[PDB]
């Protein structure tokens, strides 16, 4: 609650932490496919972000934690379609939705 | 509005998949 | 960009002094407020910049609009998705969400899926377990391009550089203030400090004058300079180490 | 000139330390380094810019 | 964009209602 209390501390994490999953990782681009006319790995901070977000998904009883963890799923779901090592990781979060 | 677009588009996509799973029924009886 | 910041030659936002007396200045607090105002505004701008993306012959004509915005689907994958010819990333997301709906991972345990009827039909495989990596690799094979027509029969950097230069001039003026203030309070043990340290720095600057070109090709280092004593006394040591 | 040496640091400190003692005896002028940085016409031009910003912001 | 998603969303709603009409065709094809 103290972390997700502020209007600017609980709001930077809505934008950075889904973006930190595919940090420095060769995602399958589509600019080439629009202009013709998979990574098999992760990074060093992707593991840490997946760990933090799986630990943040354990906030039960619908306090302030799962209120964040439900509003990040439609954006992380696009990141799981690109990187298959985000299927083994982000496991307890996916079980907690 | 960003939430109320996605929470209807995902239900539309779920319905688009369930309709294909129901079209599975209409090609077993033929 | 890189994974580490880029080293650069010119300075970047040197400090503001804090030891000036506020009974006379009463302005560094206001500049401080302006600086954290700029940092807050820049925080907002950077967050929004990140979040803004978050015989009979045939006719064959390769058109202008051979474009990968709408790419043709194989009919098995068209039946699995439902859409006719949408896109490639839409196809990958639809396949992955179908897999996520049918609860096939595990109730590598999450890599291996449970192969069902339609998905084995669209992949032409017959395994029970097969990892998701190869499943989404096959999507690249299962998609074919759209058919053509066939008919048969700045200034901000310089501005910040100027503010940095001006803050350095502020630091210079504040240090020149603080010297005369500390000499004004107790003048004895700063003039003794001056007479010591100026002498020591003169000796340090005059520690290098006998290593020139024509001051070493001549003979006025080795002969008769027992007044100096520094070199030509190492020769009892340097021969004993074999250097010569 | 991108790097510094022991001679450069010692010469810089000795120069800046002898410029400070020569202001007590007043055997150096240093009016140019004073007035080129004060520049009172530049000061009143900047205050006129602040006054015009007060007018444009009100 | 406060206009634009709404400019999408009602449109998608109409498609759902239009698909409901196709559901009515499934109530009339048998």
The residue of chain C nearest to residue A76, with distances taken between CA atoms, is C54
Q: Tokens 């004058």 sit at which residue? A: C209
From A92, A87, A67, select the one nearest A77 (Cα to Cα). A87
- Angle between helices D6-21 and C188-205 in degrees, nearest 10: 140
From D44, D24, D20, D45, select the one nearest D33 (Cα to Cα). D20
CB A26 within 8 A of CB A39: yes
* Angstrom distance (rounded) from CA D8 to CA D55: 49
**DSSP tag of C221:** T
CB C93 within 8 A of CB B16: no
CA distances from D43 to C22, C23, D35, D40 (A): 21, 22, 11, 5
- The total of other beta-carbon atoms located within 10 Å of residue C129's CB is 11
User: What approach was used to elucidate this structure?
Assistant: cryo-EM
CB C100 within 8 A of CB C145: no
CB C113 within 8 A of CB C99: yes
* Angstrom distance (rounded) from CA C17 to CA C222: 52
* Angstrom distance (rounded) from CA A14 to CA A93: 16
* Angstrom distance (rounded) from CA C192 to CA C210: 30
CB C142 within 8 A of CB C136: no
**At residue D43, what are phi and psi to the nearest 5 degrees?**
-65, -45
From C79, C80, C97, residue closest to B13, measured CB to CB: C97
* Angstrom distance (rounded) from CA A80 to CA A90: 9
CB C62 within 8 A of CB C148: yes
* Angstrom distance (rounded) from CA C124 to CA C119: 8
Kindly list the residues from chain B whose CB atom is less than 8 angstroms away from the CB atom of residue C98.
17
What tokens does C106 get? Answer: 């595990």
Task: Report CB contact under 8 Å: B12, E8.
Answer: no
| Residues A21-25: contacts with CB under 8 Å, at least 24 apart | A21/A46, A21/A49, A21/A50, A21/A76, A21/A79, A21/A83, A21/A86, A21/A90, A22/A46, A22/A79, A22/A82, A22/A83, A23/A49, A24/C3, A25/A83
* Angstrom distance (rounded) from CA C143 to CA C71: 7
- The total of other beta-carbon atoms located within 10 Å of residue A21's CB is 24
* Angstrom distance (rounded) from CA C153 to CA C224: 113
| Owning domain of residue D30 | 2-58
Candidates A11, A71, A74, partner chain B, best to mutate (most B CBs within 10 A): A74
Q: Where are the alpha helices (DSSP H) in C114-216?
A: 117-123, 132-142, 155-185, 188-205
* Angstrom distance (rounded) from CA A24 to CA A27: 9
Number of domains in chain D: 1
From C108, C109, C104, C99, select the one nearest C139 (Cα to Cα). C99
From A67, C53, A96, E11, select the one nearest B9 (Cα to Cα). E11
Are 3 or more Cβ–Cβ pairs between C and D shorter than 8 Å? yes
What tokens does C96 get? Answer: 């992955």
CB C53 within 8 A of CB C206: no
* Angstrom distance (rounded) from CA C139 to CA C90: 11
* Angstrom distance (rounded) from CA C78 to CA C81: 5
CB C139 within 8 A of CB C91: yes
CB A64 within 8 A of CB A11: no
**DSSP tag of A19:** T
Contacts of C62 (CB under 8 A, 6+ apart): C148
C115 three-class SS = coil
The resolution in angstroms reads 10.1
* Angstrom distance (rounded) from CA C69 to CA C88: 8
**At residue C131, what are phi and psi to the nearest 5 degrees?**
-70, 155
C27 three-class SS = coil
Task: Report CB contact under 8 Å: C197, D17.
Answer: yes
D13 touches chain C (CB under 8 A): yes
Q: Where are the alpha helices (DSSP H) in chain B?
A: 2-26
Q: Which helix (H) or strand (E) holds E24?
A: helix E4-26
* Angstrom distance (rounded) from CA C140 to CA C133: 12
| Chain mean position to CA C190 | 45
Number of alpha helices (DSSP H) and beta strands (DSSP E) in chain D: 3, 0
C45 touches chain A (CB under 8 A): no
* Angstrom distance (rounded) from CA C229 to CA C225: 7
C60 three-class SS = strand
């Amino acid at each position: 609650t103290e972390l997700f209390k502020s209007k600017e501390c609980s709001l930077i994490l809505e934008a950075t932490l889904p973006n930190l999953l595919s940090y420095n990782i060769a995602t399958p681009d589509y600019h080439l496919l629009q202009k013709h006319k998979f990574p098999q790995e992760l990074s060093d901070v992707s593991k840490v972000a997946c760990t933090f977000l799986c630990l943040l998904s354990n906030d039960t009883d619908d306090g302030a934690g799962s209120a964040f963890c439900q509003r990040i799923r439609p954006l992380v779901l696009h990141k799981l379609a690109d990187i298959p090592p985000l299927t083994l990781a982000l496991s307890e979060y996916m079980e907690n939705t | 509005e960003k939430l109320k677009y996605v929470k209807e588009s995902e239900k539309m996509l779920n319905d688009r998949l369930s309709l294909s799973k129901q079209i599975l029924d209409l090609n077993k009886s033929l | 960009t890189q994974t580490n910041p880029v080293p650069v030659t010119y300075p970047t936002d040197a400090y503001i002094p804090t030891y000036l007396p506020d009974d006379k200045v009463s302005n560094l607090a206001d500049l401080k407020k302006l600086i954290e105002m700029d940092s807050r505004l820049d925080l907002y701008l950077t967050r929004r910049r990140l979040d803004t993306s978050i015989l009979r012959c045939s006719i064959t004509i390769q058109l202008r609009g051979v474009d990968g915005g709408k790419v043709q689907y194989s009919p098995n994958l068209a039946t699995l998705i439902g859409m006719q010819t949408g896109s490639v990333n839409d196809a990958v997301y639809s396949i992955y969400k179908y897999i996520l709906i049918n609860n096939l991972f595990v109730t590598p345990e999450l890599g291996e899926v449970k192969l069902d009827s339609l998905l084995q039909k669209v992949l032409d495989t017959n395994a029970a377990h097969l990892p998701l990596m190869n499943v989404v690799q096959t999507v690249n094979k299962l998609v074919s391009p759209l058919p053509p027509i066939i008919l048969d029969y700045a200034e901000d950097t310089a501005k910040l550089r100027e503010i940095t230069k001006l803050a350095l001039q502020l630091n210079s003026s504040a240090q020149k203030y603080q010297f005369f203030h500390e000499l004004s309070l107790h003048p004895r043990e700063t003039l003794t400090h001056y007479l010591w340290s100026s002498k020591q720095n003169e000796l340090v600057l005059q520690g290098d004058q006998y290593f020139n070109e024509d001051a070493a090709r001549t003979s006025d280092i080795y002969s008769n300079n027992n007044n100096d004593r520094s070199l030509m006394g190492n020769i009892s040591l340097l021969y004993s180490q074999g250097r010569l | 000139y991108n790097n510094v040496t022991l001679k450069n640091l010692t010469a810089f400190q000795l120069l800046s330390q002898r410029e400070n003692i020569c202001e007590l005896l007043n055997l150096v002028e240093s009016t140019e380094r004073h007035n080129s940085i004060i520049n009172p016409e530049r000061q009143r031009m900047s205050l006129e810019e602040m006054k015009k910003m007060l007018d444009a912001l009100k």
